[PDB]
Amino acid sequence: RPRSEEDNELNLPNLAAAYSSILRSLGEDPQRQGLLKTPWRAATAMQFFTKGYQETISDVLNDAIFDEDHDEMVIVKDIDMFSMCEHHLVPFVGRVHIGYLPNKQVLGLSKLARIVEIYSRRLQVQERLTKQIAVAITEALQPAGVGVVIEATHMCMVMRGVQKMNSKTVTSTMLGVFREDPKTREEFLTLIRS
Amino acid sequence: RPRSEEDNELNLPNLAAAYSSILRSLGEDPQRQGLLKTPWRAATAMQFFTKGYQETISDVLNDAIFDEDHDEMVIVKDIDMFSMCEHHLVPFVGRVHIGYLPNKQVLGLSKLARIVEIYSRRLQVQERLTKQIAVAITEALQPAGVGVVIEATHMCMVMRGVQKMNSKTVTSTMLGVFREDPKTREEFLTLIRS
């Protein structure tokens, strides 16, 4: 079952308490002026960053529409996406590019974006995020094909560790005719550019 | 039958009345200085945005010219297009790119643009608009192939809902040799770029 507003109320305190704990463990003074409301703000923020858990793809995946009259490639590019890597709990941000070729069912353009929000607002791994978005579209439309590309900057690779600024991670899922047909894949890849 | 100038005169008052009603229902004061002439300006504007309904492709689709001496790809790119999504009545704007390979008939360059104006100036859905443009060119010229790509920004996705600024919707229709021949499709897709 998805997370609920009630769950957030019951758990908000525990989160706030943990963040307060973190502040002291870092050497900071949780009493300090600009740090007083931080435990609640940090908690509220973390809950927002993970609000995808309180939603289920079922809802959105049920608003598909029958239409076999639009044999054309549909792309929704540059969808801003913000997520949290599950490994370090630091965010990774960037853009998602979706494209599909319908068979008999189509999906509302805004619904595609909502699929991205439901999965990106969770503790994630870029490869899983990509696949989940692609699988969602596949299962909701049974399309001829679908393509999903994600370009993002992982803060845990820029702010720490290997510390490679400029560095970006790109993940790409090509299904159906997007994988089989060279003309199809090349088209999507061009249309999502610049 | 297509809408007429007479139809617009008879309906202008009703539109004006409806917009005036909207102002009140929103909480504004229709009497307020800068809102007085608004009901008429809004109505007149909305009629302009849908002036495509008072035109029929028939007129334009009858100015095709016989010519089998020009075996080359013809592209008219970056055609500015402004339309209203039929779902929220908010406009979506962007550009249309058209390309075709003639058989025995050609179409005046400006006429291609007029085809875009007739369909884009109506309450629309981007996929339908794309197809209608492509179908018009196909039926008027029986070309070896045709390609139509539309790149637009849907205000209803930027100003509200999923609220994804930067986000763009691209629809692509490839017919005939544009779909069959990889050389052809790649060429159109390159020639319409930057």
Next chain:
Amino acid sequence: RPRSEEDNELNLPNLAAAYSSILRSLGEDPQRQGLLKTPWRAATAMQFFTKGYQETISDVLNDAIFDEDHDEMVIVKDIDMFSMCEHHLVPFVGRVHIGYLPNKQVLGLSKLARIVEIYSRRLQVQERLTKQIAVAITEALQPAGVGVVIEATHMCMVMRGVQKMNSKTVTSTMLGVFREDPKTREEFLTLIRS
């Protein structure tokens, strides 16, 4: 008094009714498949575009903080903004650039953006919007100076009337030292660029 959620419920039906009327007055069939839920989607969207009326600067303008230790220029540029021109009820969109030199009081960065949202989310005129943002910051902080620049595209000038695509409207308010000191104004103007 500001608009309320109750006001929106009571008025939703009338709005929907007005939009339904508009559809018929345009020549469309409100029964047509993709136009059924339009009257409500349009109403809900128009309420969202005007949600600024249900908020009062008072709330946000009461979270100023005392601080005379940060004598430096503070700028929040590229704030996305979406508004509706009160003359034609078509949206004008673009960006807002804010800057100020504090005296003894500072304002949280996110709060500057919220000021933009409260005023932009209404039927507007770019000049008024600009001044309202500037005046809010002025009255909340009594700063040494403040600057507000708004760059936006008015759809009613692109999609109709003079029909000037590419055309943009820029409004600029310079108060206090931002107006008096050439070094100050030039700095703000440079730092808000590209």
Next chain:
Amino acid sequence: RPRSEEDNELNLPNLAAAYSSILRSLGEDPQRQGLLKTPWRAATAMQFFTKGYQETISDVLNDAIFDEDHDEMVIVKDIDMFSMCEHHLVPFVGRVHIGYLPNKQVLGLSKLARIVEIYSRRLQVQERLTKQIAVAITEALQPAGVGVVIEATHMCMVMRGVQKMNSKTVTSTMLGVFREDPKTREEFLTLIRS
């Protein structure tokens, strides 16, 4: 006294404990495969993001060199900087531009960058960070003037709250001749561009 490696060892368990608690309070399963080592990775990451507390400007501020033979503007632009806002514990990232006009003392170029690292790797507020950098350079060199500009993206304004992507916060401190002389400030502002 500054934080130490010993302090980090003693506190790591509590940090890990707090993050583990956060995972449960969010609705996740700390036992889940990709979340097992998260409590430690997150803690270690957070200690790195705040490693500035274990350093004191004193050290670096004692490697100033006497030199009154170099009357020219010294600028170190595009210094990558990664910090954590103290309000939401979400990072804000961008660039720092430093410039100064020496009197009799100069500072090694790399040292200027180290000043940014000591103060940015702490829980911060952009205005404070800016001033601290400026103040350090001032106290270490008694220069004729100094300028510090910071351009950064606050994830807590992009990923949540006002949710303004594209939005950037610029803070600017001009001291000495950088404030008094218009020729000086204009030069610094130009030379740090593109």
Next chain:
Amino acid sequence: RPRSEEDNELNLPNLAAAYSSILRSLGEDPQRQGLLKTPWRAATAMQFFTKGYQETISDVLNDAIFDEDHDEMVIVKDIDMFSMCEHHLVPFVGRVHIGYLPNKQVLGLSKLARIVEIYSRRLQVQERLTKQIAVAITEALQPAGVGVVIEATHMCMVMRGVQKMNSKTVTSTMLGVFREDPKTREEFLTLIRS
């Protein structure tokens, strides 16, 4: 008195006759397929390029509104403009940038554009065009100041004569405070850029 629709009807045949004469004098065959309707298309086109003669600034210059509450700079940049140089009857095209500081009167943004259309749509000289636009705004508003910049490519300089491609002609008029105040002029010049 301005030109009229009647005048265009009476004069259309002579224009058509003249263009037909030109075709023969150039060595072409006015009977040739793609040249048959040319005399009328050329004439009609030329009348459109000069439709400014059938309008008078008086009309537009009377829609000025009283308003002394908006002391801010108003700019409308990137106004597309197409004109015909009176010397060779070849077109010169580019953009117009307008700006002003009001005293007690303001002008609708779209009205500024209409001023550009009334004068640009005539046989012109870039300097005169610039001045007329400026003088109109001045006489309609009695502003604190006004600036008008025009950037255009003269085809008669690219396609012939000195044949300098890439070459552009910029004309700039600065009146009132736009001329006197260095802070004002610099601001306008910056805000109309890129």
Next chain:
Amino acid sequence: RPRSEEDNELNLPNLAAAYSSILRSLGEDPQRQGLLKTPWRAATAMQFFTKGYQETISDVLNDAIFDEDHDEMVIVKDIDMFSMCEHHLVPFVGRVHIGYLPNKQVLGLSKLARIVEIYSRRLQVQERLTKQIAVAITEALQPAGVGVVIEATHMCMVMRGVQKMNSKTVTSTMLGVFREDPKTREEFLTLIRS
């Protein structure tokens, strides 16, 4: 037979006469200061825009050189081209990109450009212009293949009619290997870019 300098002298007066007539028919005063010499300047200009008629491809198409030692793709890109649409007698301008794979004969680089000038300086249609350039190169060299791409802005589509600024027309002719071999065409298409 091609046009001659004598032909231009005999016809100059008639052209001048026709343009003078056009001035009157438009509402202007041919006596007015800046319009006195216009009838001659326009006529002279129009003769220059159509000077291609006084040249024959035969001349240039006879300076081919035997050489089967240079099996490589030769491209001359970004050739500025100015022409007049035969439909409205308004100019269309842009660039021409030429490419070919020789067999046994080569053509001087400058000669390729002269071919463009001969055909572009006439009353034209973009498709025909493209073909003529391609046909010329083919008949002069019997190459393995040839490609000609023209990108231009039609003033009759920007300054009037559909009035689509930004709009461009691209025509592409691919012959021989340029049409058969996908590697060949893709290479030419890449090498003529940016």
Next chain:
Amino acid sequence: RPRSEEDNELNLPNLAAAYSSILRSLGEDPQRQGLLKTPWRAATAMQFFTKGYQETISDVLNDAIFDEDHDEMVIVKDIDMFSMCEHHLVPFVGRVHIGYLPNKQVLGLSKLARIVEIYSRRLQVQERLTKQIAVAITEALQPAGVGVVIEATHMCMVMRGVQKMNSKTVTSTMLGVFREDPKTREEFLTLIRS
């Protein structure tokens, strides 16, 4: 007296003889296929590069027009210029930017470019070229001020000697108000940019 067409004929053989000699002195075979006509082509080419000597500013500087009604800055930027440095006889190429503020006399836009051609088409030194252009405009118009900027690449500095590719020489002449008034100079410098 300026050089004449007769002079070019009498001297063409000597030039050709000199170039023929140079070929031998370099180690080449003047008999070799692709070098046969070189002596004449090089000679003719060199005469064209120096065709400025056969013209006198007098002619062009006598087409000034009285006009004290256009008090505005006139700029013709990006004038392509090709010259030969007198030191090594290698060409230097780039652009010239001209601007002026008239008093009572104006000059035709194309005439400004012709001034550039007469002087650039000689053996030159960038500083001299710049001044000559400025002095010509000054003596022809007695303007309130004039500015001339030249940005060029000297091949003798890229292809040899210091061999600095990317390197560019800029020369700037500011006269009258262009030198005295900071507002004026700044405007010119901005309007000639990008």
Next chain:
Amino acid sequence: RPRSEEDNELNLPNLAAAYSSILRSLGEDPQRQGLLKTPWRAATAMQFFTKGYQETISDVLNDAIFDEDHDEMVIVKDIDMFSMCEHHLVPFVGRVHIGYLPNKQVLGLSKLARIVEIYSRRLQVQERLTKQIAVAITEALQPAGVGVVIEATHMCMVMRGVQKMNSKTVTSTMLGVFREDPKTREEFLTLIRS
């Protein structure tokens, strides 16, 4: 046998003499201050531009190294190249892009550049230069394939003749797998871009 330093000394006087003759034949005064040393500077310069004649590919083509362990594409792009067209003795400049797939032999990266220098510094024809570079690499390495692309601006086409500024000449040689394999050629073409 290649040219030698001795050859340059013996021939310098004749070159100088020829250039001095050219100065007089053009109408200049070789005695004039800035032209005195020109004959020697021009001569020395021309010898430098043709210094490739005093080198033989043999030398460089003998520093190949055995290595069959690096099966990967090696590219050296953006190699600055300056040459003189043999037809007019005017320079053509641009860049050279080399790529190859080794079999058993490799070449040092700088050595590839030297190959470009030996051939480009001679009186040339772009097509020949391209082939010579490719042939050299082929004969020195017996590679699986090789690609050479040259993009240059010919001054004799910009400064005179067809006078097409912006115009560029691209020559491309694809050998072995670079010609046969579409995957290979497309890769090289992509990796040498922007």
Next chain:
Amino acid sequence: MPYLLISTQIRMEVGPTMVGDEHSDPELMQQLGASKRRVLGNNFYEYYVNDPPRIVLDKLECRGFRVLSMTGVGQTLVWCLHKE
């Protein structure tokens, strides 16, 4: 009418399978359960079936046809059958 040409796009384990042009044997087309259509973009009619090519090959066997050659052109698979 001895020769026959059928084809299928992208993937073979699923239809549709194109089995004829305008002048194809109406009876044979009917036997195969093929419908006639004119896809947007094509300036010609075609006969097709929703069956994968394997099923169509077996059906043609029954009507006395034999596969002579099979080839791929682009992403389309084509079979040349002969009445033997």
Next chain:
Amino acid sequence: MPYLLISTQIRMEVGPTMVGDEHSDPELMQQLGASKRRVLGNNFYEYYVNDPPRIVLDKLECRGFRVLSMTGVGQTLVWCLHKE
């Protein structure tokens, strides 16, 4: 002249079908109703018919030809027939 090579581009259910080069059997070309042409860009002549390849295959059957092999090269379909 036992061997014959014919081809068709892009789509098979429609012509034209190329049926011969310059040195093709004039009589056979005539029997097929083929015309000779030289398309712009090609440095050679060709014989073609507006019939789809299927129709041309049946006609060649009558003149005693059999399809030995069929292949795709690019977007062009080619048939190799032998006089059997």
Next chain:
Amino acid sequence: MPYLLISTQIRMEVGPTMVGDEHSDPELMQQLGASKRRVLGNNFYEYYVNDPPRIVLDKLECRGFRVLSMTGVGQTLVWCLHKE
């Protein structure tokens, strides 16, 4: 069921080898040791084996099949076998 179509992607010296669609002979599929699956993105089921095509060809020989034609389509290799 005389006709059979099998394929393999990219490289032939390794599997998997696709050996059937939804309506394939269940017994034959079992004899080959093939499993049925539906790869993400495909709107159909397929029978495959981890064996390289050569091994699958020898096995089909035993069940009385003969290769009639082999072709490449894209990067996929396809074999058309007939029960002979």
Next chain:
Amino acid sequence: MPYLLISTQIRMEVGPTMVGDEHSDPELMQQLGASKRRVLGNNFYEYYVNDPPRIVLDKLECRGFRVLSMTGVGQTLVWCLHKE
């Protein structure tokens, strides 16, 4: 030497036709009127004729060869003939 491989590029109605490698039957190459060359870029020699492939196929018939298979690889057309 029973097997032979010949090919032609881009268009079939015109030569050249590649008819052999370094170890090809010198006599057969001579009978065909083929010359030996090494094109720049290739690290091997080849035998070619200016005849279109059809002409070369007829000549090979006379020397007792039969086309076993024909295929397209890239824009190149290839024929596999056997001494039968």
